Amino acid sequence: KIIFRLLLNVLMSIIAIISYQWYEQLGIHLTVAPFSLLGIAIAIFLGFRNSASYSRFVEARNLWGTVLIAERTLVRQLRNILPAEHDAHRRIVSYLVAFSWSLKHQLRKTDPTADLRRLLPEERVTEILASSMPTNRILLLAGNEIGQLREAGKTSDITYGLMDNKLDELAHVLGGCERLATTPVPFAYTLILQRTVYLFCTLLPFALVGDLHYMTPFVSVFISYTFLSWDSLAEELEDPFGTAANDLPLNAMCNTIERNLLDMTGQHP
Amino acid sequence: IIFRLLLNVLMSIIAIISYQWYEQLGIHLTVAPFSLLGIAIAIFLGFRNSASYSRFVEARNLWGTVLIAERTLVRQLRNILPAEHDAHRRIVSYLVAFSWSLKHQLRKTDPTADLRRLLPEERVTEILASSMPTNRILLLAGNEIGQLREAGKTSDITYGLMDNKLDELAHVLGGCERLATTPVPFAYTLILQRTVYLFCTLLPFALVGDLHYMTPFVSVFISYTFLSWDSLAEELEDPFGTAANDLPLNAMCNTIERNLLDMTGQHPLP
Amino acid sequence: SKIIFRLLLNVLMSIIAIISYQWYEQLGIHLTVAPFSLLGIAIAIFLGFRNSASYSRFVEARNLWGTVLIAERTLVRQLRNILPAEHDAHRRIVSYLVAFSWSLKHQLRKTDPTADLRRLLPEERVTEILASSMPTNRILLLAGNEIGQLREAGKTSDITYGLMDNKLDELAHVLGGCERLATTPVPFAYTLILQRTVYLFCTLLPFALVGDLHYMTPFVSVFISYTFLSWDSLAEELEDPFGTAANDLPLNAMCNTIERNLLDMTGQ
Amino acid sequence: SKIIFRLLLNVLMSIIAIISYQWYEQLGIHLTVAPFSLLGIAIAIFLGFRNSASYSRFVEARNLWGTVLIAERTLVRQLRNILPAEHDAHRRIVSYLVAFSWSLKHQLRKTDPTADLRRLLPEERVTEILASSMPTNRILLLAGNEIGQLREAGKTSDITYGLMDNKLDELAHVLGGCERLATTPVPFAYTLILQRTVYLFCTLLPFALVGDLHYMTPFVSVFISYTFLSWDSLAEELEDPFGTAANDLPLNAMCNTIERNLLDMTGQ
Amino acid sequence: SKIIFRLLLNVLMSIIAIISYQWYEQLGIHLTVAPFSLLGIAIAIFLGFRNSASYSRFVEARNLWGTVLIAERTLVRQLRNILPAEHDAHRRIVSYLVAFSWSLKHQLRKTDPTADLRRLLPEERVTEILASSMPTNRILLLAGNEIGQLREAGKTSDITYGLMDNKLDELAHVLGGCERLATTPVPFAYTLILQRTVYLFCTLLPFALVGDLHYMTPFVSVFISYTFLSWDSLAEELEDPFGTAANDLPLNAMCNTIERNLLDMTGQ
Ligand SMILES: [Zn+2]
Ligand SMILES: [Zn+2]
Ligand SMILES: [Zn+2]
Ligand SMILES: [Zn+2]
Ligand SMILES: [Zn+2]
Ligand SMILES: [Zn+2]
Ligand SMILES: [Zn+2]
Ligand SMILES: [Zn+2]
Ligand SMILES: [Zn+2]
Ligand SMILES: [Zn+2]
Ligand SMILES: [Zn+2]
Ligand SMILES: [Zn+2]
Ligand SMILES: [Zn+2]
Ligand SMILES: [Zn+2]
Ligand SMILES: [Zn+2]
């Protein structure tokens, strides 16, 4: 990965050293002052870009953090307002749990058919999978469970609207996660930075060899490691729903959500 | 942008063959002053690009709310009034019409073809007669919500629940209008774009003393780094502007229309 | 602006440094570029963060006025969908909302709102507004009465009353925001430090450049000075958003768009 | 200024640097500008972030105080709109809201609230307020009882009670926000050591600049010193917006505006 | 912290660079200052952004605990204004709220919350709370049962039940926030990369500075090392706001202030 290019940068230094003997046999000079200017501007641009990536990562963590909050209070409101409708308690929790797993499959571009059948009846699974957005359909079914208790006079419009806002909050999370996934800036994330940091890292030893007869690979790999490590960190934080090392553990976050919702409805795993 | 890189290579070749006659005229160009100028320009480019990225992000959040507000409004209709299927299809029309009309407004394109597809020509003429057609569609959508209230089909509580979604839409409309007008740097972005253009063309004359024949290669690498970062802030400053990328705006209006058709049992086929 | 004046004074400083270049080593005064690159970089950093504060504040002023259009649009829409038979109460409330916009413009510009208020309101209400030490705030209080009368007359439930009252709370957050922006600018210490250092650094620059540049001193010292001055002047023209300059907010055109919007919704 | 003493103390070090430059090679002390350019730019970067964080505390503090004027403006308006006859209730609540502002100012300034409290409230309540742990929270609870007494008396429905109740919640969020900015500043390691670093870099710069600028050392080294020192001491001021510095918030003027607003003539 | 040991190692790395500068020619190692300025400045830029992210994380944790005090204050105030007679619910709800604060404290600190919980609640509720793997969430559910009973008993309307329910929603968002901060830290690649690069840069620097500074190497080197290491440790000590150091949030002091505030609003 990054060590593979760190090794290549060492070979370019070796190329720049053994070919430094034939430098004067050509009209080439490479001072370090121009590469200090270029390198500093790249560092500034990497500093701002890396900052924008971390902002996405925090927003993704926050959006998933709201899933746990909204689904907790929706179950809490269901208990305090309607403590005797335990049938709706189980059915709504199964929709809320399915919403979390289906959102994970949505952001991961995987098949939710396994987790859907585990939690919901088959007639519901076919209705949910047949939608252009199954997570949106799950919120609709959860709203029908809330809304059917309203038609039965079991809850007022006020206490209905109280629970409605929780579904409204989940919808904002779904729209927010959908936004973060389908929002890549144009190819400037690679056209500008992926090329330049690479091209600057491999051309740097050819300019550093004039000052340092043999210390070039040490200094060049140190600068190349500093720049490449900062740039590669930005790529990981840019896509927080992937399977990288520094990406959101979505499977663990969904297990915590199902554990919470079952702990509130008196069910032991 | 490639044209200005060929101009830069041509200026480097000029600075090489002309490097003879600088002697004794007293015209010496070092690298330290141009290194100070370049680092300063890079700082301003970084701050400018930061404000541009923020405008691009706010544009995404506004259109994201369009998808959210229209989904929850249709969901509230099915959960509260599951039997009023005629009111369903009417309100779904205006919400889909609101999305396309808003896109055509930001892109200064004609919304007539999209409006005729979704709404009857009586309402299409009323919408196209108003100077603010996107606001007119919101008013018509409210008249459907208000008619369900006067008909005694919705309480004042549930009317307020749906009314809040039209408020989320109206906040988006005004937000996109505020972004659509030319931004806060009143034609001052043309100065910083030319400051970069002049710095990249005066650079090979400063570098040729230290680099000689390596000037066309190092000067074009620096010019490309500066010209690419500037042109990026140009694309971000104008998310709805002329000659922008219509893919995400078209995909969003298509996504919401598909969603609402699915939520109203219209899309799958019998 | 005066930016083109200080560019010419910078040209004169380049000429002084070019011809006085001789007596430097005699008096012992040398000026290299290296310490000026340190100072010029720290000034560019501080210039960047300062312009960031000026940018964010100009955006906030644009956001506030954008809310006036939104809240008045929806408050009129709600009156239509809820009380379509009350056409008389429509025009009474729309006139107050239009007056609120114009009075907020005249307040932020310190101009006379008496002319616009008499165009939209009866003289009894104009006297009531202009008698208050905070006339714009009194306009909201009168708009709250038209909403309140509809509630006490039984034509509006407390629920739908609360839906309309919230729009007046949005207008109340705009009034306080504009007042806060108008009385609290970016601290003077920022514009005091940078104005001094940028100007002193631009004039001393040809002295520290002539040793390396010679006859290229004027064509480079101006280029560098034009970069710092244009950036410092960008904040000069972004710190007065409520004014009447070319780069200020078009509050007159904004107040016209609002009055044009609210009359399109009420069929006038 | 707080810098005017340290600026002159730096000019003394520049004289110590110029007299002892030929004696560098006799004592074996070569000094260049390149290392101090690295150290200076790193401090300028850290100063830019530090100063930016301090201005954020200033903006939030000004915004928190702006909400007080907005929330108390509308709370009086809703009383005047929903219960236009309860002028005795209007008066009692307006006095509590004005006492809330002066009490919060004295809380953030650590001054005595007994003065402004007796100016606005009966003595039976000045004792109940001064005897509480948090007196500002005590004023809010008394303002809440007035809204609650109107509700238990049937004069106010649960819907219009919640409208006014939310305005007091907005005031409680301002109290918690000001307590936050006050009772926990920036970490002291920020200000403690960053002050050390800028001073030492300013008083060692002429020893490294004298070689390049043999006699221009005092000027260029005080120009750089003024730039770095004016930025640090300004960030030091903005960290404490509720303080009494020159660039802090005018809390006494703001409380005057709130009072002049609410008791405009009678009941706003 | 342990920064003093890293400075003395740098003083040893400088004398090793001085006693070994002779064999630079024989071993064929050249080291100029120009590349170490590009590296150091880039390290400084990344340090400035990283330190900036750590400060905002500390501030978010500070704001979360600020919301606890605000929400618990207004929930007690709303009870005294809506149900001034129902004191059986006053004492139970206040005890549940104070238990929420202490449970959250021990949760972020990973300490035993039994002592504080039994000091506030009966055993049949202390056992149920500690029997759950989410004890702090269970305290909110029990607090909801109190508000829910008052509504079912006909003592509050659904409107007033909704007004109080939105305070438990506010407390639920704080719990999710603190958990999200405690579990999900600043991505470890920041401390991974920057600590490697800063430490290696401070040891290699005297070998590049000794060619220009000679015997002045240890002073300028340990100065630059002190600046970089202090800024790096400052970001490290801001990344853990729920720690036990004096540098972190005084969670014990905040929970004492909350328990005093709620017991004061109920006259205890
Ligand atoms: Zn919530
Ligand atoms: Zn149950
Ligand atoms: Zn919504
Ligand atoms: Zn239908
Ligand atoms: Zn479809
Ligand atoms: Zn609104
Ligand atoms: Zn009408
Ligand atoms: Zn102006
Ligand atoms: Zn408000
Ligand atoms: Zn009154
Ligand atoms: Zn001398
Ligand atoms: Zn609150
Ligand atoms: Zn009590
Ligand atoms: Zn009892
Ligand atoms: Zn134990």
Residue numbers in the entry:
A (entry chain C): 23 to 291
B (entry chain E): 24 to 293
C (entry chain A), D (entry chain B), E (entry chain D): 22 to 289
What's written in the study?
The human BEST1 gene encodes a protein (BESTROPHIN1, or BEST1) that is predominantly expressed in retinal pigment epithelium (RPE). BEST1 localizes to the basolateral membrane of RPE, and has been functionally identified as a CaCC in heterologous expression studies. The simplest and most logical conclusion based on our results is that BEST1 functions as the surface CaCC to generate Ca2+-dependent Cl- current in human RPE. Since the structure of BEST1 has not been solved, we generated a three-dimensional human homology model based on our previously solved Klebsiella pneumoniae bestrophin (KpBest) structure and a chicken bestrophin1 (cBest1) structure.
On the other hand, I201 resides in a loop between S2h and S3a, surrounded by hydrophobic residues V114, A195, L207, and L210, which are conserved among species and thus probably important for the channel function. As the Ile to Thr substitution changes a hydrophobic residue to a polar residue, which weakens the hydrophobic interactions, this mutation may change the channel property by altering the local interplays between spatially adjacent subunits, but will unlikely disrupt the channel structure as its localization on a loop renders flexibility. Sequence alignment reveals that BEST1 P274 is identical while I201 has a highly conservative substitution in KpBest (P239 and L177, respectively), prompting us to test the predictions from the BEST1 homology model with the corresponding KpBest mutants (P239R and L177T, respectively) expressed from E. coli. Purified KpBest mutant proteins were set for crystal growing. While no crystal was grown with KpBest P239R, well-diffracted KpBest L177T crystals were obtained under the same condition as KpBest WT, and the structure was solved to 3.1 Å resolution. The KpBest L177T structure mirrors that of KpBest WT, with all-atom alignment RMSD (root-mean-square deviation) in a protomer 0.4 Å (Coot LSQ superpose). However, superposition of KpBest WT with the L177T mutant based on the alignment of single chain residues 174–180 showed an obvious shift of the TM region. By contrast, no currents were obtained with KpBest P239R, while currents with reduced unitary conductance (mean amplitude 1.5 pA) were recorded with KpBest L177T, suggesting that the BEST1 P274R and I201T mutations result in a complete and partial loss of single channel activity, respectively. The structure of KpBest I177T suggests that the BEST1 I201T mutation does not alter the pentameric conformation of the channel. The condition contained 0.05 M zinc acetate, 6% v/v ethylene glycol, 0.1 M sodium cacodylate, pH 6.0, and 6.6 % w/v PEG 8000. Taken together, we concluded that P274R is a null mutation that abolishes both plasma membrane localization and channel activity of BEST1 due to structural disruption, whereas I201T is a partial loss-of-function mutation that retains plasma membrane localization and Ca2+ sensitivity of BEST1 caused by minor structural alterations.
